[PDB]
């Protein structure tokens, strides 16, 4: 019919039209956006001759300014703002503002000055600056495309990217005030009003966004399972803050994205992964769709209404034009590089020249032009301003978007260094070593023998894309550094690859290893970590000052009460507001006395509420002094509102009742801080682990890694230093923030937990022992259960001494034997320095630290052990005098477990998991763990799959004859934990801490009583 949506067939065609320029001109360096332009111009001149086509074409190309803006902007800003790696523009912010701040405006008034100069249109300087504000937005898109492709390119891309994106926004601030300002003059304007404006467009703004970015996240933080509702809710976050802060509030909408775009990337972990993975490539289709459209229309509009209007001079403008923009971005650049050189990471002069040629303009400036273009209509303004944008736009997508690639050339910036160029040749080697493996494989089955292998091995090749003397003993020393700087990239690596390690704690432990390895003699020094762990003061200051205000024990009624009354305020504020606004609202009559009803329940509300405070609390209600706040707000109403039955009565009151909740606000303006040093421990327990763990990998490389026993030994000395720094530093951290630390710690076990749960259920489902619909209803709930964790409190309570008793590894759910324990473990309280035993001193009992950090000291062997920690396990089972001696780097705290009392749990509690196995393998899965490790150091397993290995091992009873026999079908490992051990054949004897070798078929053992033999086996998954 006549009314149909002539519009589908316009979006439709242009889609069609984007997918057959992207896909021919995809390998051609030109832009397939220019293309696009030509198309647009070649269906511009035949719907001008064609009066059907024009129909098709005339109700999207005349389409109204506001329309445009607030479908496609939000969309481009939005998706602009959305694909930053937001960590890296944070760490560069002050270095991406100056420039796109500061170089916007003095680059768009340089612009405004040339187009007044220059050109015979004799404009104005409104109409120059909405000239220049939309000449000087940027879309490097084309750029940081091939920055991300390359090396030390990976930390300019942001930077670039994040100018183009605060540099679009202001230029659409600047273009708006200057549009409204030449095609909708206001009569005048005061100082005050200019400086509301500006707070309304630049301060205003930002707020807005933030707020309803936050709101957002909550509520995405609490969908569980409703992917939908998620991808919903964050398209009606978008269009509905531009939306509302454009036309109901007028702040700057486009501001408002940016943020939001900005705080929803940052918060990303509050997104489901599988929606987070769909909202990017989302938006990009979204984006790509309006730069489509807009090209299109560009192209029409130009070859309709532009291209009748231009002399041969301008032509002549247009390339003196482009020439005096790339020079004032040249100027202002150059001109700020004294500045930014001081600041984040500072430009290099390749980079100046990257940064200088690569900002290309985009649909953001033919936007602008366009709706220019409409608002003038008749007037040659327009035509001009799209004739120029697009020629604009036009030769930067020709010139600079096709030379940036040569231009990287000449830099040197292009090229892959060596250590990537051997990565990918040796990537490339595995890879066709596996496919020859693979092919003779396949050339044995009976069912494939006759496969034309000519063909299938040509289809199946990968190629390769980028094709004792003083100095021979400082080349060992840098050889040894080197290699061992290698081995911590790839044991970081692996660690982030296994989910032990945060991406940004990984990041920063690569970049302090390779920028170790730039410098001459440098290793990792833990002093260049410290800047993970060390907490900005000002969060705990206010942390302190905060918990003061409501600390509350002169006083210190169900809680309910206080949240009711605190409800029934905030739902006052209604009313208060409506009379304050009503009062100029009349200046409605009836509303004068609606008001009043509302005002008595409310104040009766509040009588009522602080009489059942007052009886409850006796004569204490009145020493505190929020509740002296709360009477003086009932002793002015009381007299208010009487007197009432005006500018008095309206004014007090809108400030006084609000006020009383700023109690309630105080506890979460807590947690705020809470979350912020949550966040800066998680880290920093991330990467002084994750350095530890990358330590303890080197240290067993190295050890047979390096030849040399001197270069050996400096090199383990620095890293035992390093370590030790490290275990100190962090064990620190808990005692000055308990509750933050067990939350970080607690979040980190369960997501451990998960994870190996996850892991379990794919191995059933690869197995076939469960369904794949099954596999997936499990892994929904382990998914839900994960995100919960980001909703955990940021500070839990740190459990009291009664609870860690009750968590040991050896005492867990043995309620009888909890009890025993409990009631014989005395509590002792030492002080700074202190010495809490000694080498030599006789196996007395064991320590556990409930408060505190230790040192070890003994027999060149230093350690530091915290809370958690139990010291003389060994000890006690083998009634050796101890080996250590343990020294108060702080005031500790530790339950003691006399000696005896341990012996008489030991003989009473013997059921089959008797106390005695408990303790015996906790002690034999921490004296296995090295030598597994020991056994496997060039193989593929870390320290944390040798402990999850051993853990599915059992001590055995040698009790049954005293001799053992290896089935080795069903002993992946077998260890020797204490005593000697003969070998049936050959009797030869081993000693008690080693490894059983797989020559070894039987043993036998001696069974004197004061070292008895015990063995830890591991079995086969395929048990018997």
Not at 226 to 252: K, M, N, P, Q, R
Not at 608 to 625: P, T
Not at 757 to 763: A, V
Request: aromatic share 10%.
């Amino acid at each position: 019919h006549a009314h149909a949506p002539k519009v589908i067939v316009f979006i439709s065609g242009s889609c069609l039209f984007g997918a057959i320029s992207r896909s021919l001109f995809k390998k051609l360096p030109i832009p397939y956006t220019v293309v696009l332009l030509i198309l647009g111009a070649i269906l511009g001149v035949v719907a001008s001759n064609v009066p059907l086509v024009e129909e098709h074409t005339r109700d999207v190309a005349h389409m109204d300014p506001h329309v445009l803006l607030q479908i496609f902007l939000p969309v481009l800003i939005f998706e602009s703002a959305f694909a930053m790696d937001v960590h890296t523009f944070m760490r560069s912010f002050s270095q991406v503002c100056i420039l796109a701040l500061f170089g916007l405006v003095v680059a768009s008034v340089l612009t405004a000055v040339l187009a007044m100069n220059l050109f015979n249109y004799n404009w104005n300087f409104s109409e120059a600056m909405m000239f220049g504000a939309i000449m000087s937005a940027t879309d490097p898109v084309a750029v940081v495309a091939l920055l991300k492709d390359l090396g030390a390119s990976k930390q300019l891309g942001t930077i670039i990217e994040g100018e183009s994106l605060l540099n679009d926004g202001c230029a659409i601030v600047i273009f708006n005030v200057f549009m409204k300002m030449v095609f909708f003059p206001q009569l005048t304007s005061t100082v005050g009003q200019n400086v509301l404006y500006f707070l309304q467009v630049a301060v205003a703004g930002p707020l807005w966004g933030y707020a309803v970015a936050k709101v957002t996240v909550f509520f995405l933080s609490h969908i569980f399972n409703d992917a939908l509702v998620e991808i919903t809710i964050t398209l009606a976050a978008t269009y509905l803050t531009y939306y509302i802060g454009d036309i109901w509030l007028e702040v700057s909408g486009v501001l408002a994205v940016v943020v939001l775009g900005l705080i929803v990337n940052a918060e990303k972990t509050s997104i489901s992964p599988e929606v987070e993975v769909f909202l990017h490539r989302f938006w990009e289709m979204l984006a790509y769709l309006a730069n489509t459209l807009i090209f299109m229309m560009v192209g029409v509009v130009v070859t309709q209404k532009a291209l009748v209007a231009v002399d041969k001079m301008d032509w002549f403008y247009l390339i003196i034009l482009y020439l005096a923009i790339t020079i004032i971005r040249g100027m202002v650049i150059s001109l700020f590089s004294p500045i930014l050189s001081r600041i984040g990471y500072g430009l290099t002069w390749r980079n100046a020249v990257i940064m200088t040629w690569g900002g290309l303009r985009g649909a953001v400036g033919l936007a602008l032009a366009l709706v220019v273009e409409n608002l003038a209509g008749n007037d040659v303004i327009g035509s001009k301003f799209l004739f120029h944008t697009a020629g604009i736009v036009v030769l930067t997508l020709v010139i600079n978007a096709t030379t940036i690639q040569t231009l990287l050339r000449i830099l040197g910036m292009s090229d892959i260094s060596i250590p990537k160029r051997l990565a990918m040749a040796g990537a490339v080697r595995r890879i066709h070593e596996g496919q020859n493996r693979t092919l003779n494989m396949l050339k044995s089955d009976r069912f494939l023998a006759d496969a034309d292998w000519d063909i299938a091995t040509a289809a199946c090749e990968i190629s390769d894309p980028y094709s004792p003397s003083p100095r021979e003993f400082a080349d060992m020393m840098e050889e040894a550094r080197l290699r061992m700087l290698k081995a911590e990239k790839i044991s970081y690596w692996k660690q982030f690859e296994h989910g032990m390690l945060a991406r940004e704690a990984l990041r920063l432990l690569v970049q302090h290893a390779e920028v170790a390895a730039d410098e001459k003699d440098q290793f990792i020094l833990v002093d260049d970590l410290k800047k993970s762990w060390q907490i900005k003061g000002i969060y705990p200051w206010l942390k302190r000052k905060l918990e003061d205000l409501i600390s509350e024990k002169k006083i210190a009624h169900h809680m309910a009460f206080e949240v009711t009354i605190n409800i029934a305020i905030v739902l006052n504020i209604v009313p208060i507001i409506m009379e304050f606004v009503v009062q100029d609202k009349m200046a409605l009559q009836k509303i004068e006395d609606a008001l009043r009803i509302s005002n008595y329940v409310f104040f009766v509300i509040y009588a009522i509420e602080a009489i059942v405070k007052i009886l409850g609390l006796g004569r204490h209600y009145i020493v505190s002094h929020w509740n002296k706040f709360d009477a003086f707000i009932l002793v002015v109403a009381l007299v208010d509102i009487i007197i009432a039955e005006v500018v008095k009565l309206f004014r007090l009151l809108r400030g006084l009742r609000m006020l009383r909740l700023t109690k309630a606000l105080i506890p979460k303006l807590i947690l705020v801080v809470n979350g912020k040093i949550n966040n800066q421990l998680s880290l920093g327990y991330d990467v002084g682990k994750g350095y530890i763990i990358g330590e303890e990998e080197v240290g067993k490389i190295i050890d047979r890694m390096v030849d040399n026993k001197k270069i050996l030994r400096e090199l383990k000395h620095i890293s035992e230093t390093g370590r030790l720094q490290v275990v100190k530093e962090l064990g620190l951290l808990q005692r000055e923030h308990p509750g933050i630390a067990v939350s970080v710690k607690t979040r980190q076990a369960i997501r451990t937990i998960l994870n190996h749960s996850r892991e379990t259920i794919h191995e059933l489902q690869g197995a076939g022992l469960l369904d794949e619909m099954e596999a997936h209803k499990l892994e929904l709930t382990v998914e839900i259960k994960m995100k919960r964790l980001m909703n955990a409190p940021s500070s839990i309570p740190p459990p009291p001494p009664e609870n860690l008793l009750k968590n040991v590894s050896w005492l867990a759910g043995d309620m009888k034997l909890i009890d025993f324990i409990k009631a014989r473990a005395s509590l002792l309280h030492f002080d700074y320095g202190e010495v809490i035993v000694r080498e030599g001193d006789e196996s007395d009992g064991l320590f556990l630290i409930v408060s505190g950090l230790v040192k070890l000291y003994g027999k060149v062997f230093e350690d530091y052990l915290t809370v958690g920690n139990v010291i003389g396990e060994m000890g006690v089972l083998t009634k050796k005098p101890r080996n250590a001696t343990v020294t108060c780097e702080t005031t500790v705290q530790v339950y003691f477990i006399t000696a005896e009392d341990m012996n008489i749990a030991i003989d009473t509690f013997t059921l089959y998991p008797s106390l005695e196995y408990r303790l015996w393998r906790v002690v034999a899965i921490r004296i296995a763990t090295p030598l597994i490790m020991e056994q496997m150091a060039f193989q593929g397993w870390t320290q944390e799959k040798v402990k999850l290995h051993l853990e599915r091992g059992y001590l055995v009873d040698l009790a049954e004859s005293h001799f053992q026999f290896n089935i080795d079908a069903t002993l992946e490992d077998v260890i020797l934990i204490n005593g000697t051990a003969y070998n049936a054949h050959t009797r030869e004897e081993i000693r008690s801490p080693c490894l059983i070798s797989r020559t070894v078929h039987k043993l036998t053992f001696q069974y004197t009583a004061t070292e008895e033999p015990r063995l830890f086996v591991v079995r086969n998954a395929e048990y018997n």
